[PDB]
Amino acid sequence: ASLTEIEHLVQSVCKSYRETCQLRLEDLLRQRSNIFSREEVTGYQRKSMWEMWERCAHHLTEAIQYVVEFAKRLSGFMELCQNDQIVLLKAGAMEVVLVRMCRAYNADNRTVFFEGKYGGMELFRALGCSELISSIFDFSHSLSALHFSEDEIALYTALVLINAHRPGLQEKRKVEQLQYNLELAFHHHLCKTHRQSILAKLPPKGKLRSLCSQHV
């Protein structure tokens, strides 16, 4: 792979992301002004934990399906073996969802997009786990600080998935091949866009995985 070939990979990954992002960035930002009323918030808080779990579990399952679609469209993911493809997605899909979530988070008012409008963390009071929820809001808030480009998310979340340190892989060498090219793609693009400053500020990939191991 030469350097013009790396730009095809970058473009490819950015378009796979564009297709599989579920929520359009334009739409998310326009909806920010559309925020749940105190009456509506109370409505959600009045609900059973069980109903909130079903709604949340539904919406996030859908979210995972979109990540799987993304992965399927990455160059050479489908060329991996079946066991490896599952290991990578089992370990990485939820992590990608958590990173993608920062686009739906408005740091001005500490709110997140949920069922058509923006709500604070008190929306999910019924679930009875503010530990998990504030820490999801905190993580989203810190990624908000970076003002991630769409392409930066695409490239970064591709590297979240394609990680040859996941235990269970049968073809480590094959997955390193992709990881290494994707790393070059990411680093190259950050040079092209004078955004090398963000490498020092991305969260550690240990800490991405530890907030999902606790999740479960």
Ligand X SMILES: COc1ccc2c(n1)CCN(C(=O)[C@H]1C[C@@H](CC(=O)O)C1)[C@H]2C(=O)Nc1cc(F)c2c(c1)C=CC2(C)C
> What burial letters (b/e) apply to 12-49, b meaning 16+ CB within 10 Å?
bbbebbeebbbeeeeebeebbeeebeeeebeebeebee
Sheet hosting strand 117-119, strand order edge to edge? 105-106, 111-114, 117-119
x/- string (CB under 6 A) for ligand X, residues 131-170?
A: --x--x----------------------------------
The two tokens of residue 2 are 């030469």
Q: How far is the CB of 199 from ligand X (least distance, A)?
A: 23
- AA letter at 3: L
Q: How far is the CB of 100 from ligand X (least distance, A)?
A: 4
x/- string (CB under 6 A) for ligand X, residues 184-213?
A: ------------------------------
Q: Which is nearer to ligand X, 5 or 62 (CB)?
A: 62
How far does CA 196 lie from the centroid of its chain? Answer: 20
Does 116 sit near ligand X (CB under 6 A)?
Answer: yes
Does 59 sit near ligand X (CB under 6 A)?
Answer: yes
- 105 three-class SS: strand
Does 97 sit near ligand X (CB under 6 A)?
Answer: yes
Instruction: Catalog residues that contact ligand X under the rule CB under 6 A.
Output: 22-23, 56, 59-60, 63, 97, 100-101, 104, 112-116, 124, 133, 136
